[PDB]
RNA sequence: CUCCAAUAGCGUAUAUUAAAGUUGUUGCAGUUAAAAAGCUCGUAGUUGAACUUUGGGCCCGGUUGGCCGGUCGGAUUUCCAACGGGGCCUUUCCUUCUGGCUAACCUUGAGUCCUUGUGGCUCUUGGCGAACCAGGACUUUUACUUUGAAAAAAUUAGAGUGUUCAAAGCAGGCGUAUUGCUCGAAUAUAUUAGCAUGGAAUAAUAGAAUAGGACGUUUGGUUCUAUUUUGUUGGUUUCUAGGACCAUCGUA
RNA sequence: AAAGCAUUUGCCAAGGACGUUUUCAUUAAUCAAGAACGAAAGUUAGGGGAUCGAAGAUGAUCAGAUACCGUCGUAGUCUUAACCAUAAACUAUGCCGACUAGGGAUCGGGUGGUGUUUUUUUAAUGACCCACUCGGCACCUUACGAGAAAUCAAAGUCUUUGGGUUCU
């Protein structure tokens, strides 16, 4: 959101979660920034290289945080074989 | 019975995007409603969706992607002037500047900012946003 | 849903719904049935002229127990009689019976107003002055 | 409807001013007028080769179509040589923004050209004041029924 | 759950399903070539038949109506055709 | 659900994906017509020719092998019934409960009964009157009621 | 006594509008606050599943098809189809016989004016139907929507204008103020119904089932009719042309 | 359908659910007017003999007791014949349709099992067990949601306010 001279305007720009696509207020408490490890060659977790998903305090009420992160890291190859499209 | 089934349509796509699937299966099908999920689509509310070809009626599975506040159905499907449209876009869209309402011209079904570039008007279907 | 019709073709059913529910409004009913004509002592007037029949102490209801010191009128034009309240202090000595005094409403639409039980009118003029004036000592009343 | 022999009534039932000869032999038994009505409306055969006088008559007859031109549906034929016809419409009522359904009754005054049915939308004219209430004739026929 | 594949259900969970309930619906019942001792003739039975069906020759039984599948009568061999 | 009950069942046929005949049918397409019209002679119905071709001689369903319907065969062969079975079927059931109810009337359940399949009765003649099946008015009556069904 | 509010005005009464989403189309409420008929049938009324084809051009995105691998089974996309989609500028219309009428040449017919001449105008001989005349229509009717006309003035919104301001009013303003020049007095709104017009989505309606179905470039027939024409008008018939009707054959 | 309906047995018609590769093809939903059916309880004329209390008869209790308590008793849920149709006629929740959540029971139907048992040796059914499914009466846990709250899987999908329709 710009105004027209293409100068930035609305003093921040809030994050979304990477299951459902909503807005993450900025009170919502029950959300959840997951940080993962990224490895290399004889293990030995690289400090401060991530990979980062965020879930929503809806989804994680909902019982649905296991089943969106099984999903969300096997299509960033984190797994295989853990998840399943076709139920 | 079944008066409508463009509003059981939006009914299943709205109950689906509130529980946060992101996808729906809705039965039966329409060229309405395949119009009005094509107008969905080209302004990027919705994905893509598949008709499933029974032999009767036909099933649409349609995939979401967030991002759809509401699609409403408005019934009865009042006239509308195209003076009027305004009157409408005030009422049940949430700002002046984004969101849709979907007429039936007798150019086509089509939302109403190109209705007004047409320079059409009708009957009124519904809103998404 | 919401329990009335919505069909394009159903205007008139709306309508004469409408129309039977205004019924049970209370100014729309008195509207249409002349109820300020036939019922009311003044005929549907902000005001009108009586003639003073009775001095009247009427008890102030709970939890006041003062006497309120009003009198009671027949009007000219309907033969009515109705109690009008006197208001502040000494007016119930500048009137008298037979004084031919002008009635006004009493606030409330056709309510009792305060503490006084069953009176729906006040006196504004006695003997055609005024009552502010005889109180203030401003006018004063005619000989008769 | 039904019809008669055309000399029923107490008077001699003729078309006025046409006046046929009985001095020279002349192959019609009767020297017929009849008259185009106009509006892009075909004289039906029925008038130009009948024997039926019907002075209201749009064609043959003493009567101008001019004014309107209303359709209806024909609900009864019970009158001689007139019908009644009803005209169905929707009122927009503006605080509710819907309508609702009312309708007309139009008496109007069929020739013995046409038969009519209960049914038959039927396209009528107005005309000249008939009688107390008809002020339109049938013009073209078309069946509902098939 | 809130992502699954609708239009490649897993064959288990269609088979499990209603009749009527599935992606397309269709009959979960068949036709029988059954064989009866007498004769050798070709006899095309329903599953679900109604009717007491009986061969054309001799005309003895080949299998009662039951509220479900007809219950097919004493050895008679049958195949699914 | 039902029109006359609270009843929401849902039991019903399903037909196939497919408008062709199995590969191994393979009779005919016209010597089930033969047979269709062999058991309409003998007063068979159209709901129980294809029950009985069904169950016997294992056609799937007669439109798909042949492109007609059961009774519009029956008709062009000029075994049409007077009356729909449709029709025939609920006269038939509300002749059986007025003789019931003519002798004892105290059931207060068959008299409530009888009023729902006249019911029935009458909403369907009404369609029959309107696709010109029935003749314009033909105004089923009681008292002429058990001369129809026989 | 002091202070507050409005002020040449301020209080009181009755009515009415807002408040009032406390009349609810927008837009109320009905388990317990007021309110789901004891229950079911049922006519009017209201409402009712799905299904019937995409011609102008230019710019944009993909998705397939290859000409193309750059490369250790996947990695970029461009020139070309059309494949529907999108934005623009625009096409676009009426589907017919009788001739009116041909608009232009399909003409090049006989050569001319002027720079070596398709630079350049008059033109007959078949030869352009859309540019509209009058006949048949196209022929299943609507609802809906677009545009247009026609809609008294005043009131309303509103343009101009220093009535000294303003409410107003429709005036006025500039010279050479000596014998005159000139701008104004707009525009909008005016729904429902009627009229004229474009659209063909939405929602109805009709069609061919005992075929009395559609076409016809087939042949037998019936009746009605009389425009031109044999000068004439009227009576008749030869042919012509036109309906209507009854058989047969053809087509799909 | 409601009011309501419980040991037999036979007649007489009716009905939901289920199964169905049967048939028709929109015939449907809700419904002013109009109708059918209604706990009990006295309009109204055999019979059979009170356990209950109006009242009444009575005995207590009490300041009084015309009431509660005790004994008896006529009208008064048994005829054969109507209520005009009234109930806290209640789930104080109209009817039809669609969607949104997890579970374990149970009633009826159906499908499957190199299951158990009944005996002929297992067989055939029956009863049972496991799994699934359709349709019911319900229940348990939560609250994304709703509500003024109590609470509610509908009383949710409602200021992001429109599925159809009746009544108040
Ligand atoms: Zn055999």
Aim: charged content about 25%.
């Amino acid at each position: 959101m710009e105004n027209d001279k293409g100068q930035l305007v609305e003093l921040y720009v809030p994050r979304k979660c990477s299951a459902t696509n909503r807005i993450i207020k900025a009170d919502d408490h029950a959300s959840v920034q997951i940080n993962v490890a990224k490895v290399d060659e004889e293990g030995r977790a690289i400090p401060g290289e991530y990979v980062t998903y965020a879930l929503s305090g809806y989804v994680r009420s909902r019982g649905e945080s296991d089943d969106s992160l099984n999903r969300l890291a096997q299509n960033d190859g984190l797994l295989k074989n853990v998840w399943s499209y076709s139920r | 019975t079944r008066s409508s089934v463009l509003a059981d349509a939006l009914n299943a796509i709205n109950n689906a995007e509130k529980t946060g699937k992101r996808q729906v299966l809705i039965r039966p099908s329409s060229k309405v409603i395949i119009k009005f999920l094509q107008v969905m689509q080209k302004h990027g509310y919705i994905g893509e969706f598949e008709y499933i070809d029974d032999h009767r009626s036909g099933k649409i599975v349609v995939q979401l992607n967030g991002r759809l506040n509401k699609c409403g159905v408005i019934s009865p499907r009042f006239n509308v002037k195209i003076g009027d449209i305004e009157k409408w876009t005030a009422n049940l869209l949430p700002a002046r500047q984004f969101g849709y309402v979907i007429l039936t011209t007798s150019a086509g079904i089509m939302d109403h900012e190109e209705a007004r570039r047409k320079h059409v008007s009708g009957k009124i279907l519904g809103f998404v946003y | 849903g919401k329990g009335k019709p919505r069909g394009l073709n159903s205007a008139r059913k709306l309508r004469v719904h409408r129309r039977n529910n205004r019924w049970a409004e209370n100014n729309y009913k008195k509207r249409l049935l002349g109820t300020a004509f036939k019922s009311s002592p003044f005929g549907g007037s902000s005001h009108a002229k009586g003639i003073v029949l009775e001095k009247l102490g009427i008890e102030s209801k709970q939890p006041n127990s003062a006497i309120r010191k009003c009198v009671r009128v027949q009007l000219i034009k309907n033969g009515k009689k109705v109690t009008a309240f006197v208001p502040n202090d000494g007016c119930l000595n500048f009137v008298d019976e037979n004084d031919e005094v002008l009635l006004a409403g009493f606030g409330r639409k056709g309510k009792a107003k305060g503490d006084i039980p069953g009176v729906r009118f006040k006196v504004v003029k006695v003997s055609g002055v005024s009552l502010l004036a005889l109180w203030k000592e401003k006018k004063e009343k005619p000989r008769s | 409807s039904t019809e008669l022999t055309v000399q029923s009534e107490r008077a001699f039932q003729k078309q006025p001013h046409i006046f046929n000869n009985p001095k020279v032999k002349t192959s019609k038994r009767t020297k017929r007028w009849y008259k185009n009505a106009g509006l892009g409306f075909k004289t039906p055969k029925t008038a130009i080769e009948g024997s039926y006088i019907d002075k209201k008559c749009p064609f043959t007859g003493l009567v101008s179509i001019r004014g309107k031109i209303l359709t209806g549906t024909v609900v009864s034929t019970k009158m001689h040589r007139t019908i009644v016809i009803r005209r169905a419409y929707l009122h927009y009522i503006p605080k509710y923004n819907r309508y609702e359904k009312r309708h007309k009754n139009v008496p109007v005054h069929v020739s013995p050209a046409f038969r009519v049915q209960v049914g038959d939308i039927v396209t009528v004219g107005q005309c000249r004041p008939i009688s107390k209430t008809v002020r339109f004739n049938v013009v073209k026929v078309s069946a509902a029924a098939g | 759950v809130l992502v699954q594949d609708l239009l490649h259900p897993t064959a288990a969970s269609e088979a499990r399903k209603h009749k009527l309930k599935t992606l397309v619906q269709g009959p979960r019942s068949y036709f029988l070539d059954v064989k009866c001792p007498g004769c050798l003739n070709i006899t095309t039975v329903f599953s679900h038949a109604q009717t007491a069906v009986t061969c054309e020759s001799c005309s003895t039984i080949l299998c009662t109506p039951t509220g479900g599948k007809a219950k097919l009568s004493e050895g008679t061999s049958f195949r699914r055709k | 659900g039902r029109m006359h009950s609270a009843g929401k069942g849902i039991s019903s046929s399903a037909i196939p994906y497919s408008r062709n005949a199995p590969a191994w049918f393979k009779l005919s397409s016209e010597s089930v017509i033969e047979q269709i019209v062999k058991y309409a002679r003998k007063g068979l119905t159209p709901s129980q020719i294809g029950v009985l071709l069904r169950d016997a001689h294992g056609v799937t369903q007669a439109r798909v092998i042949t492109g007609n319907k059961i009774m519009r065969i029956l008709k062009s062969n000029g075994l049409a019934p007077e009356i729909p079975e449709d029709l025939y079927y609920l006269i038939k059931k509300a002749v059986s409960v007025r003789k019931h109810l003519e002798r004892n009337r105290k059931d207060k359940d068959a008299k409530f009964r009888l009023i729902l399949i006249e019911s029935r009765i009458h909403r369907l003649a009404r369609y029959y009157r309107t696709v010109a099946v029935l003749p314009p008015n033909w105004k089923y009556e009681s008292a002429t009621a058990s001369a129809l069904v026989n």
